[PDB]
Design a protein around this nucleic acid. Structure first.
Ligand SMILES: [Mg+2]
Ligand SMILES: [Mg+2]
Ligand SMILES: [Mg+2]
Ligand SMILES: [Mg+2]
Ligand SMILES: [Mg+2]
Ligand SMILES: [Mg+2]
Ligand SMILES: [Mg+2]
Ligand SMILES: [Mg+2]
Ligand SMILES: [Mg+2]
Ligand SMILES: [Mg+2]
Ligand SMILES: [Mg+2]
Ligand SMILES: [Mg+2]
Ligand SMILES: [Mg+2]
Ligand SMILES: [Mg+2]
Ligand SMILES: [Mg+2]
Lengths: 156, 70, 85, 120, 94, 102
RNA sequence: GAUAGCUGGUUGUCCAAGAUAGAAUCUUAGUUCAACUUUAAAUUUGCCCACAGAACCAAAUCCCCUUGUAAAUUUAACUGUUAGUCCAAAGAGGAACAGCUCUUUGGACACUAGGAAAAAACCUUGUAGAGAGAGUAAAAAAUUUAACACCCAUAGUAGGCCUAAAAGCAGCCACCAAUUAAGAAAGCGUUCAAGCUCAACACCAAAAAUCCCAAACAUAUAACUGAACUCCUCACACCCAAUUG
RNA sequence: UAGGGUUUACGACCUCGAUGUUGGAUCAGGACAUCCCGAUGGUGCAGCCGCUAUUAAAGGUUCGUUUGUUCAACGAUUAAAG
RNA sequence: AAAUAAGGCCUACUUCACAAAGCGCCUUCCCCCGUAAAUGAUAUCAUCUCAACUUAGAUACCCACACCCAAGAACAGGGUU
């Protein structure tokens, strides 16, 4: 079933081929060992983690602020340990789970600064000739967080 | 060197759930992270194509094979 | 979006009874477990009520089947008794 | 006049080809269904709205279980075009008194009693 | 230039609406789901004759509970505690 | 408008969708078969009889002769004892090759 | 300060329930009853219900146990609705026309949300808030019919009836058969015959008046984007005309 | 079988706490189902005078007698008084 | 040579006067798609091309205080030896 080379004999995209599984696993293990050695040597600098807190994925780095639109019932001035991280890295290397990462692999330290409220939000509804005029003011609660640092271990 | 639909599909086909805000933030302030993500997406796309073509037997994609839970 | 999730059985919506939401979000720095959330408790109560209703329906169906079998046996015994005398 | 649409008997008659296509079987059939509304009640007759209200499917995309009996069978068929039906097969035993807090529905109908949060 | 009668969705003449692939695939998947539901609705378990009174006790209990809750419809009680505490509006210090 | 009309009434959106989805889909031949694989007995008998009775047969290319010319030729051939013959070639070629007349 | 079935208006915040079969009327721009709706209360059955039951001159409908449910009857109040429009079917008159007039069954509009371009009536979807979150319902018009197998012509003759005449086509009959192998003639043209072909044999859909109207690409691997719909952290009484509580 | 809303109606959908009603005067915008100036095919085309079908709207489209009436009769013109 | 519509003028003719106007005088230039023809195949005939290729097939005005005016409602413009 030979097909002479023509404008439509073969697909336009390049027909690439993947390597063997043995060599692929070998290279994977080699790169994993290299990354473990680099982490043990302390070459990383200023780590960053994507913390999925309050149903929102924040691109956290270090010394950054976060404001949540709800209450957590925590006294201002207490250390908190966040989890559900799935994208840790820095330079020349990255780390991500499937989806979340191991607890012993990442450690996000955060604290509470204040627990304020949102600015006076105005609610209003109107219609045409229906005498519909509804008004209401809402002031949802708010909080503030500060990630002290993001530690990492050579657990691999 | 990729498209948004195929990229999103490949990212979803790897248990790496990431919203669009974080993706844009990384692409803006982390070009290497987005490059690695695009490389992983292209690898997943190629693996899925090879599987659909040969029905595996028995590689099942080194990057595929989702982690089961219970 | 990703409808492929249904093929593996890991919830079409990633925020559905999965490890990304059911798992506790934060925790104390000393390692203590944070108290459960109100949404988690609501989902747990809903699951408990669903399981209770399913068990009750199964028990009712079993009782109905047993009652039908007993009625059939009683009718057969009555017919056998009437056959005599 | 748009009357109450009825359904004949030839429709609900599973054939060997249908059984081979799906996973269900005639002998030892399931006992409960997984009702999940996938269509709104609006733009439909009033009797269908009443049936939906009686079945308890106000919030769409919500699981629900009902008896697999002729009465409930017809009640479901009445709105079949507005609900998703699937069997409730339990891999293990029914939820005992000890297996009531750690449970999960899971898609494809698979009520697990040992619901944990760890990888295999 | 395309002048047509008033209102394009009613009257003797209307703008011809055409179907696309999205609606076709939607109808196809809907018909597939409907056929699956039909197949699932073709295998009873009690055959009617076995459900002539297997849960009437539960229905009667629910009806009795509803009747008791309805008959309980009565105004609330009254206490002197509130009437006496209402006098605290003029609480004075030394 | 009334149910029946002289013109083609515009069908409803759902009606048109159902009519389009329920269209006819003929089969799809994977290969298509388009690219896949009496009197004659009397003629043969007469040709065999002629071959058996051809003590002195001739062949010409009479075509440019009119009807009157053919009649005159037949008259001339009737004057001196000799007959004419006109047979096809499709039925004569097989017998020609079979009679060892290469 | 007349009356007036009539025009106009009838003042702060928020929550909830809230769309009618018809009849009478010196009457259809107004009124009452009935029906719908609201409040407090006593009672128990309210709806889809299954065998069956329900006429001589098609979709259907009534009762209907188990079964889903929690709705229904009455008492005592009283204001508000009682001119409707569109869509699918039965129709009625009209032109098997009208954003044409009127009923029966269902939906929508008078109540927000996402689209079909600007749309009430079309498709999807409702319990009401925030977040710089995730997953979905409806959702993008397609399509160009016309050649053709185009090689090649003796005759018993002008057959007979009428036709002064049609012999092969003003009209009727049988339509044989010699040419080696095929029309008492299938068309064209002749007053009438004269001439030219054929049957067969030998390779053979668009047009109306201010100016057409979203740029625009047939060739990188089916899946994406897409709501006030579902979910994620908190607490929930905080999206109907008139009327009512 | 397709296009018309220019004639007669047909329906009353905002416009009766106002859209001032026909001709005739200046001004004309646009469409061709084109009267004429440009080009073709046929013809019961020996030529003009004629007829038919397609394109071309850049231009032209009279002077007067009557009835209030666009319309309605008549005298003379130019290739034409659409 | 005459008119139509447009661009100009008072020296002859008039209304008339230190002007303006016409009845008076000068000028006005580019093809328009509707057809008829070489050469050959699908269709070795023939054949104009919704097959390949050839026939009737932009020129013009322009872009350095104060007095009078053929320039002008003001503004603005031209001259002021
Ligand atoms: Mg209109
Ligand atoms: Mg008064
Ligand atoms: Mg009156
Ligand atoms: Mg008024
Ligand atoms: Mg006032
Ligand atoms: Mg309400
Ligand atoms: Mg009277
Ligand atoms: Mg009307
Ligand atoms: Mg409305
Ligand atoms: Mg909601
Ligand atoms: Mg009106
Ligand atoms: Mg008026
Ligand atoms: Mg008035
Ligand atoms: Mg007015
Ligand atoms: Mg024309």
């Amino acid at each position: 079933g030979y097909v002479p080379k023509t404008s439509l004999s073969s697909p336009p995209w390049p027909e690439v081929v993947l390597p063997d599984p043995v060599e692929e696993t070998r290279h994977h293990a080699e790169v994993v060992k290299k990354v473990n050695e680099m982490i043990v040597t302390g070459q990383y600098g200023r780590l960053f983690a994507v913390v999925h807190f309050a149903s929102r994925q924040w691109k956290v780095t270090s010394e950054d602020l976060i404001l949540i639109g709800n209450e957590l019932d925590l006294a201002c001035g207490e250390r908190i340990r966040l989890e559900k991280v799935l994208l840790v890295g820095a330079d020349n290397f990255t780390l991500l789970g499937k989806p979340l990462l191991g607890k012993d692999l990442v450690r996000v330290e955060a604290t509470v600064i204040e627990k304020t409220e949102s600015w006076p939000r105005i609610i209003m509804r109107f219609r045409k000739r229906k005498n519909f005029k509804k008004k209401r003011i809402v002031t949802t609660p708010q909080t503030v967080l500060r990630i002290n640092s993001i530690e990492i271990a050579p657990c691999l | 060197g990729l498209k948004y639909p195929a990229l999103i599909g490949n990212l979803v086909k790897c248990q790496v759930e990431l919203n669009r805000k974080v993706l844009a933030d990384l692409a803006i302030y982390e070009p290497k992270t987005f490059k690695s993500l695009a490389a992983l997406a292209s690898r997943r796309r190629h693996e899925g194509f090879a599987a659909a073509l040969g029905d595996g037997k028995e590689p099942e994609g080194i990057f595929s094979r989702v982690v089961q839970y219970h | 979006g990703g409808q492929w999730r249904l093929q593996q059985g890991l919830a079409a919506n990633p925020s559905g009874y999965g490890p990304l939401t059911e798992l506790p979000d934060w925790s104390y720095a000393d390692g203590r477990p944070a108290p459960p959330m109100k949404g988690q408790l609501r989902r747990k109560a809903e699951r408990e009520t669903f399981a209770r209703r399913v068990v009750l329906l199964s028990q009712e169906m079993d009782a109905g089947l047993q009652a039908w079998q007993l009625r059939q046996q009683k009718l057969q015994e009555e017919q056998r008794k009437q056959e005599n005398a | 006049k748009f009357t109450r649409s009825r359904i004949p008997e030839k429709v609900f008659q599973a054939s060997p080809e249908d059984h081979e296509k799906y996973g269900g079987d005639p002998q030892n059939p399931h006992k409960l269904h997984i009702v999940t509304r996938i269509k709104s009640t609006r733009r439909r007759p009033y009797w269908e709205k009443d049936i939906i209200k009686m079945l308890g499917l106000e919030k769409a995309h919500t699981p629900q279980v009902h008896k697999n009996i002729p009465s409930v069978n017809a009640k479901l068929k009445v709105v079949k075009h507005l609900i998703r039906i699937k069997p409730l097969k339990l891999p293990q035993g029914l939820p005992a008194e000890e297996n009531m807090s750690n449970t999960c529905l899971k898609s494809t109908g698979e009520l697990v009693v040992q619901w944990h949060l760890k990888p295999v | 230039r395309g002048r047509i009668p008033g209102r394009q969705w009613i009257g003797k003449h209307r703008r011809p609406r055409f179907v696309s692939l999205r609606a076709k695939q939607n109808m196809i998947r809907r018909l597939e789901i409907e056929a699956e539901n039909h197949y699932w609705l073709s295998m009873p378990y009690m055959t009617r004759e076995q459900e002539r009174g297997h849960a009437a006790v539960r229905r009667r209990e629910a009806f009795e509970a509803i009747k008791a809750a309805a008959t309980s419809k009565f105004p609330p009680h009254r206490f002197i505690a509130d009437q006496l505490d209402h006098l605290n509006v003029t609480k004075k210090w030394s | 408008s009334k149910a029946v009309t002289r013109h083609r009434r515009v069908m409803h959106f759902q009606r048109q969708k159902l009519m389009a989805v329920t269209e006819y889909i003929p089969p799809k031949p994977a290969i298509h078969p388009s690219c896949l694989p009496g009197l004659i007995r009397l003629l043969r008998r007469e040709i065999a009889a002629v071959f058996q009775d051809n003590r002195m047969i001739a062949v010409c290319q009479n075509v440019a002769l009119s009807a009157e010319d053919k009649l005159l030729m037949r008259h001339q051939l009737r004057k001196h004892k000799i007959l004419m013959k006109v047979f096809p070639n499709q039925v004569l070629k097989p017998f020609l090759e079979d009679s060892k007349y290469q």
